[PDB]
Amino acid sequence: APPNTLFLRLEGALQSWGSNEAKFALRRTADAPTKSGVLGLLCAAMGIGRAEAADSWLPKLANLRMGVRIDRPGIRWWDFHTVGAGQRMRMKTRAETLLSRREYLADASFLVALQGEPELVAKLSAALAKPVWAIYLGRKSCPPSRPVCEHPPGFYNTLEEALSAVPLQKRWHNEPLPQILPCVMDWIPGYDGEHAPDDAEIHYDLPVSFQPPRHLPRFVIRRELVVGEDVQVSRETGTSVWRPKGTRADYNNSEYKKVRAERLVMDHAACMVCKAPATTVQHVNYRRAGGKEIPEDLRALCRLCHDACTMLEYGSGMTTNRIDPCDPIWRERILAKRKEIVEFRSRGQ
Amino acid sequence: LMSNDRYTFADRDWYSPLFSYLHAEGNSRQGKLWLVGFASDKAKSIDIWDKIIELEGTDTNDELLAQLANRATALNAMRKKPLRGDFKKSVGTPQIADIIPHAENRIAINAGKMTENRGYSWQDADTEYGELLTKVAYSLEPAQTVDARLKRGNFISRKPWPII
Amino acid sequence: NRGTVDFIASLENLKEGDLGILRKLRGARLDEKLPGFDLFSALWWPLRQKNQRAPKREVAWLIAKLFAEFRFEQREGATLPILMGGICRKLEPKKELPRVLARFDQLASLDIMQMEEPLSVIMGILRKHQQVCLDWVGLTDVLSFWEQEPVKREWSDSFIKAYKI
Amino acid sequence: MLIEIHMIQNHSPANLNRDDLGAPKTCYFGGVLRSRISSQCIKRSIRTSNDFKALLLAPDIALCGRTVEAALQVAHAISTHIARPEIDYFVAADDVPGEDAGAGHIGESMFASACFYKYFSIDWEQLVKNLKGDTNLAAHTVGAFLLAAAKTNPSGKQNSFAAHNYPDGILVEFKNSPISYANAFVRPVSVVKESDLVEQSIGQLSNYVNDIRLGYYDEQSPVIGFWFSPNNRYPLGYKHSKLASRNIGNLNELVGAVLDYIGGFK
Amino acid sequence: MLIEIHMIQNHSPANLNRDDLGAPKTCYFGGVLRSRISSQCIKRSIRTSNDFKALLGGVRTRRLADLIQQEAGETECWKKAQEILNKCGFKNKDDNTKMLVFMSKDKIKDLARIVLDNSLGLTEAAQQVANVIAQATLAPDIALCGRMLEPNDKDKDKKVKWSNTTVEAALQVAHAISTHIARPEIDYFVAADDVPGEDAGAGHIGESMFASACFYKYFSIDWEQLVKNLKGDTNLAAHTVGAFLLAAAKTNPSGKQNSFAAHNYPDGILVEFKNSPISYANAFVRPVSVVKESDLVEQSIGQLSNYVNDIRLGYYDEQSPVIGFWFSPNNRYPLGYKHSKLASRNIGNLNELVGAVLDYIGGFKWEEVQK
Ligand SMILES: [Zn+2]
């Protein structure tokens, strides 16, 4: 059972599949990817020029059957667009500014199923794995945010089960999902029902050429799917909003229990400030704590000097860095804290 | 295509001629309105569009028809309302004008029900701006204080007012 | 949040001498007046050893000093925004309410290190109306995650809900 | 093969791009409203720069547009956080005293500060076929565009706000299928006391790159990328199994590394 | 060539700039709320300063007919001047036209000369009037700030077509953001009655708003566009640059200064000579907190020095070295106690800093160029 259909994921921050009714400086768009637009995307991915497209490639690929499922409808967003500001414009020339207003779709995603010849689908997918040219979503200022070559080809019978095959991928966990997903699919005669129903509407996106752009109409129908029954909700990948590493804390750990022994050996079991016999070790340079402990930034200390340094660190600021003995600074405050500890701390506690 | 002082861009001018055409022998109850619209200013073509509208009949009054026929100036009063004390020489809140076309297009799916007033109404259509205005208020009043939340609450209440 | 409960219970268990010691240290650092440092270390250190969670040191120090100055019976269901809204509702709606509301809304702008006096004025307004309870556990939990946006959102929303009714 | 440049740039409060009403241009993403800079504004500001023109069939016609189809590709500059527009109330003054203390004019202008994410794409095959097999000039104009895009900004309202900032993170990658990383900032960046706006944006970019490297980009073909911050100001994914192949602390070194990969030219 | 000045200035509690509601102006930078001073406020306070008085040769006024009458003496020509001003597309709303006009003060005598004589007709004189306002650009303040003027079209004389009446700005001034978080404060004031009565009440009760902050100021001057704005007057351009430096350093905006008097000097000035403008406003994307071991100004200067080092090491180019001077009074505040290498010259006197700046600019001396 060789695969017979190809799936396209069309999702980007900004999208614009232009409609037939623009014809002027009001560049509009359609609610779904047009057939001519995705055909031009395919021809750009295969490296076929505009003149070369009109002879064989477009008539060959116009025999496929296409259906688009809506994953996210998006929001239509306009854009004021001036041309030739501070510069002349063609036709002789004129020092003038051209005003226009463009329309894009924002935060939208579509799934396109294109059933056809298995060799055609295989060659098309092979071309789409490494596109010849940069493929955008309608306009050149709309690059895709997801790989078009994402979903694998397969063999199915109807377009409804084809759009049922691919699960719906969820964003962040709180985000809700659409409950009724509209599918817009090409009308199929079947050679028995020769006359289309009255709900079938004409769209004008059957292409012939691209340099003298020519289109013909086609009958398009619109049905719907129910999520869960027809499309299973996929689960998001392992991800999170980036947070700075809050490190960890663990002394029971045997590796630190031996690093402190190495430190007490290497400073010869003596304090750095008052040179009394050492009791513990202060953990200066708290970065790389727990798993990447280097017995260099640690400094052995007695109980009174360690308590004084902890008193100084609890007061004032406190960040990943610490207060390091052997510094010529902070000596006077450490000695004052030593005096206060000696003359004020009560052992009855 | 400019959205000047007296005009706010909202696209799809279907709402304008459904008063004069629906008042003098242009009614056949059931049918589909084809509604070719070509717009130009002096010797300069601007735009051309179309829109079919399904109608069944249900003759209605003229107050709602006149209010719907003057929707162009109802939206312009929504955008041009600031929070300060300057006179009419002002632009108001420009971020509303960015979300106006999408809400207008989403309302425009039920133009037949709006015109016949059998399942749609102006107050029925005011809910479409309610979800869009929630996201704009988070940007205009971004603080987390009580007062900023209060101004965000008052901002969602901005609904268009029919007047002719 | 059991560590916060143990912290608050140990705060209520304090005698009057160390309470006066903490009262004398309002607005101060942690590096001076050694009895305060020793008392705070005795209060806070056993929490980390048994309980894996523990309130932040700055939050715990602020809570201890505020409890020393403004001794309140800990009671569940008496969060600060709710009491503040109940006080604000029984006010003149033209002059006093904007001033007191501005003093309340000043709080949700700073960090932990500068909330002492803007909280002390709030506790003074509370003591003016003779309160007898305050949720120290909920206030500590909210103050711990003060940088999360839904925390401030729920703080303001609870204040507005108590104000409106 | 395709070259892709991703850019993170925080701007001081300004109005770098306007519309018919004066407001900064915005867009919609992640369920919220973000600030935006239109792609044609960035392309024009890159193209007409005097330092760029004095630096380098024409190289600008080969890279940009005028069937001559450009290999350049500038996307709309989305923002990694919720937009925050603001109004400034200006009053004009009169130097001549009158019967009252009138102003002369009263009004409001708009401004907004944002941390924009920029995406760029250069098609190497179209560039080399545009210049009829030439390669050294192609690398030269690629480097010229890299320096220009790293050291340029739009001129909108810069006599009053002067937002002459510099980028704080650049990521240059080589791969075949074009994918942008705007999906990283689907969740808007919210600041914390332990980080910056640029730091969190760079970290979220690193997280998204790590997740997509663990996913679609299998061992079919390795992906070569270079990460640059000034004097190693910000790391993209500290260690993290070397998510970025290199860490660079000068623009010239990144330009030389990219040139030496693409052709070995110097 | 561009001269860029970055300044750090801590201010006493005051309200130097405020919006329509009286609150001090704020902005959102780096996701955090900072205090702001608008750039036009700084530009006006420098322009109308005592230290810039020898260079003030332009007036931005709405009442030009009043100046015409006040410079014509006693002969009555005020209605006539208003009429000719209306003829060139300016309108008239009760002795003040609908637009502000920027024009050097030296040309009012010429306008008086054209308005006095009845030898010429009306409409042609209006055209002549335009030719004086389109060429009254030889002022230091017009050269610095820049002027654009677009007259009306619905009441023009159809024979009064205008020349180019714009001047590109030779000075870019940023909005003075704060290096730390915003801390707005309310001052509850009362105003008492000098005459006793029955009650103990006072005349007025209100609240004002004030805040104290450390501001980061950024200025940029384009020398080539400056000398083109004054038509090759390099001497006068250098005089403007020196006087502008003195006024910017030694002047503060006069907002509520009779009640707060925050006349604070800058604690650090960095003057750089470049070819492309760079702003160090991203030094404070992370706000500046306070540690007991230091103070606000020293921490801000250290952060600025760290970011300047980052920028210089990450954007070094051997083709364009950058020369900068650091100024602090008597070298009180150096450029951080970590590098001692980002400042090419350390200056402790403001006058020496101005002289060195002028000598780098063109080799002139200050006392030569002051006249
Ligand atoms: Zn010791």
Tab-separated table of C-alpha atoms and ligand atoms in Angstrom, chain A residues 270-278 300-306 334 338, ligand 1:
chain	number	residue	atom	x	y	z
A	270	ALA	CA	43.210	26.326	60.300
A	271	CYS	CA	40.992	29.382	59.997
A	272	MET	CA	41.850	32.098	57.485
A	273	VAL	CA	40.932	35.085	59.660
A	274	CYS	CA	41.753	34.236	63.279
A	275	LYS	CA	43.892	31.137	62.473
A	276	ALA	CA	42.009	29.054	65.045
A	277	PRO	CA	41.506	25.330	64.364
A	278	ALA	CA	38.897	24.943	61.650
A	300	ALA	CA	37.799	26.689	55.633
A	301	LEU	CA	36.541	28.624	58.652
A	302	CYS	CA	35.917	28.343	62.378
A	303	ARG	CA	32.452	28.620	63.911
A	304	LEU	CA	32.772	32.262	65.011
A	305	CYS	CA	34.202	33.576	61.735
A	306	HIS	CA	31.646	31.584	59.728
A	334	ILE	CA	34.634	40.916	60.357
A	338	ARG	CA	33.938	38.923	66.122
F	1	ZN	ZN	38.092	32.170	62.672
